[PDB]
Symmetry: C2
Subunit: 509 residues, 2 copies
């Protein structure tokens, strides 16, 4: 049993179950949302074609890595040959499979060479190497433009960056003139129209009035809502003390289950009239048995005691935090309002994506939301949402649903669909929240059918798809002509990082 040298893993390379080699051309780093935007958009393509340096480590080109891999295959084939004087036919399958991978690798290397040598007369590939802030090559742009499962979205930050590199955004909204298009390169020229401006100027207005953010835990909210219908002087006392306690219990229960059923319908059966042992919650029990309150206790103390006696601690366990509530107490600056503006925009963009990838609508939601009165109205509802500590996402969904037909949808979004958007929004926003620029993001869904894949932490297209478009059908693929279709016949656009087929050739001992 000789030890083989063919690597289990190679950048850009995927071997399917039928021993077909697929090279995945990267667009940007990431899994579902791209980690590169604006000026760095081209970095993965630069690396693929030429190599590049990252934190002092050289990342080599596809051609370099595939030539290394070829050398290793050739060593394995030689090693089989020498070992076949001693076991004349014991390695026949493996030798054939290895040669077939070698032939396919050599063909891909040739295709890269020929693209650069013969089919780049416009320097559309060479500009990755030589341009100041390069562009995606035209074949990648055409792939993106025709994708069914990945879309770019373009937002409006106050200090917008002109070097957007995704030209066919699904969601797009009016932007300022970038500072980089002005002579001093110091500040953008603002527009006083559209979604971004309405959000910013509503959340933190020219008069500098801070917008309070009154976010409460579920428990503090319930208690607060209930106590708004009482006043400080109210007591549980006098001859009608039991009627007053019953009304309190009833009000507290109603508010609590109202808030819980939003998250889970099981809680519609929650009751506060009894402890878990079936003991009646009444005045004597709370005052004389448990000794937690008395006749002169404030209503808020009565509430605390009722809840500690009747509600399991599992009910206060929080939902993961929304991106809208990061711990701040108020929106007290233009920067803060810009940050929140971008979050609202991003949520709208995620709804748009969900609607496009599920074939619910083909509209640019940003076009509707940029128009009056929608821009103003959404900003006002979100601002009010913050001052009430309400959930922001359903404010957006309700407005979308009220206007569903104008946004190109046949029906309103279901509760289920709303929760799906919310989870994608939360996860993607958390991945990109430390981006230097929020002007655009590329969002892929590799659980859906389409031309864009996830592989090795790159959002990618099939190299052969790219190659045929970039060379305008002038160089047909020969033996590789059905590889593209074979990759689509797979069960997922999320592809494995290592190649199990290169390990499981060996299992016959």
């Amino acid at each position: 049993v000789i030890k083989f040298k063919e690597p289990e893993r190679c950048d850009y390379l995927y071997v399917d179950e039928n021993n077909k080699v697929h090279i995945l051309l990267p667009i940007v780093g990431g899994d579902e949302i791209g980690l590169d935007n604006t000026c760095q958009t081209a970095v993965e393509l630069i690396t693929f074609f030429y190599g590049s340096a990252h934190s002092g480590v050289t990342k080599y080109s596809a051609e370099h890595q595939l030539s290394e891999y070829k050398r290793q295959l050739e060593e394995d084939i030689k090693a089989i040959n020498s070992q076949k004087k001693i076991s004349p036919h014991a390695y026949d399958d493996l030798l054939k499979e290895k040669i077939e991978r070698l032939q396919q690798i050599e063909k891909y290397i040739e295709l890269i060479q020929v693209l650069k040598k013969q089919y780049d007369e416009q320097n559309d590939i060479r500009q990755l190497r030589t341009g100041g802030i390069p562009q995606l090559p035209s074949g990648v742009k055409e792939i993106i433009k025709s994708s069914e499962n990945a879309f770019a979205v373009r937002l409006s930050p106050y200090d917008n960056d002109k070097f957007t590199r995704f030209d066919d955004p699904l969601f797009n909204v009016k932007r300022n003139i970038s500072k980089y298009d002005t002579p001093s390169r110091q500040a953008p020229i603002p527009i006083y129209e559209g979604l971004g401006y309405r959000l910013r100027s509503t959340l933190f207005p020219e008069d500098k009035t801070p917008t309070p953010i009154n976010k409460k835990s579920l428990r503090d909210k319930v208690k607060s809502t209930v106590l708004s219908h009482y006043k400080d002087e109210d007591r549980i006392d006098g001859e009608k003390k039991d009627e007053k306690l019953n009304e309190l219990i009833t009000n507290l229960q109603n508010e609590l289950v109202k808030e819980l059923v939003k998250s889970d319908p099981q809680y519609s059966k929650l009751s506060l009239s009894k402890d878990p042992r079936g003991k009646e919650i009444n005045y004597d029990y709370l005052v004389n048995s448990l000794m937690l309150v008395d006749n002169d206790s404030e209503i808020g103390d009565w509430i605390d005691t009722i809840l500690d006696a009747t509600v399991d601690s599992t009910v206060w366990v929080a939902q993961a935090s929304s991106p809208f509530y990061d711990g701040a107490k108020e929106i007290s600056s233009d920067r803060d309002a810009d940050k929140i503006s971008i979050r609202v925009q991003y949520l709208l963009a995620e709804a748009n994506i969900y609607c496009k990838t599920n074939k619910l609508s083909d509209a640019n939601f940003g076009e509707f939301f940029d128009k009056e009165p929608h821009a103003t109205e959404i900003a006002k509802r979100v601002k009010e949402g913050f001052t009430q500590g309400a959930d922001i996402e359903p404010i957006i969904y309700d407005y979308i649903n009220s206007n569903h037909a104008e946004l190109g949808l046949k029906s309103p979004l279901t509760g289920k669909q709303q929760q799906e958007i919310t989870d994608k929004f939360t996860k993607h926003y958390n991945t990109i929240k430390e981006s230097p620029h929020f002007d655009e993001f590329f969002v892929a869904d590799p659980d859906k059918k389409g031309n864009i894949f996830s592989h090795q932490g790159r959002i990618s297209c099939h190299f052969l798809d790219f190659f045929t478009r970039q060379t305008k059908g002038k160089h047909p693929l020969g033996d590789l002509a059905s590889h593209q279709e074979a990759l689509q016949e797979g069960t997922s656009n999320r592809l494995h990082h290592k190649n199990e087929v290169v390990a499981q050739g060996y299992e016959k001992l």
Copy 2:
């Protein structure tokens, strides 16, 4: 192929590899940190003994569930017995295993019945059903008192609750007089000594001066530090413009890498002098080729540009957040200071647990930290930590290490050990951060040997352990007398929720 009725899963029940049946008596819900505390501490024991209603769903007692399980076993043995006139030996293993389990289950049921009927004259069990705010039964207390792997900790919230139910806490600190010990039940009577008070009154003092929390992202922190060496009027301009740029690039690179290498040493090779294609970052390139800044730009604009030209976006990806930094900009009320006090206390309690559980010390750390000058000194260092945006945990660890011998430790805590405590603190605090009360928590380590286990989302003791102690060992266990030892001979105190031998009879 007859279809068996013996369940794969039953509350409180665990079957080991040798077909021994263990009933786990629950203490509180959770896995490592108990979710019930104070006045609801008893809820799992209430349910085990009597059943209870939870959010409108009835939960059945152990006896009820085990009787149901027994009926199902009896149906499975009948189904085999009638079928064994027609295939005399075809079911030999399953029948024998099922009989071994049934005899055990019956024995456990009789044990529960007798405990309640005859061995509860103290009403130590019955007071679960009766008492206003029940207590743990004495046998559970003794189990806890005797544990090597699970410990209660007791903290000092401003608004402390007198109905603590864990009587033998490892970590304990001075507490106020609970409001529940005062005529109107509305406010505590504060003490003006000890750890809790020093934290609260240092973080938000009587004069109402807010403590700033100056926590920055890595990018904002780098840029701020660099810019502190410059003045607003500074430009990259005039005859020495390239030297000034070089000095800016060198300062920015030194600060960036200084901050990154804390978290990953690979970044010691990071360079800002070239873009990823090898293009020189110089004035002509930034100003005339890319057209991003000019001679009139502020130094902060130069920084942003340099970073966007040279630094991959994966470098800005933040580490996971400490419980100490939740997004607030200042400690500006007594409630905020209480919230942060508690977190510091909980961290000290987790360091204590770690040290007890790893046999590094037996001390109650709260005793030391409650004393002057330690209470004052730790508060002051934490407060200073917040205003600098520094990591709070190592501040605590450094103080512990300066005083390691007085805290009963032979040696200071290693970097490794510190990180282990931090991870436990973070994960456990996040699980309990919405608790109505922060007075006490029960923390179990089921990866360590001891008498407390994790099972079906309950932190538990062996029912036989409890039974023998509650009974004072009168009623000897008969056939079950060595089951307790057998469970210890297992490889983990984390026990599987569904059962191995009752699931895998089906496949073979």
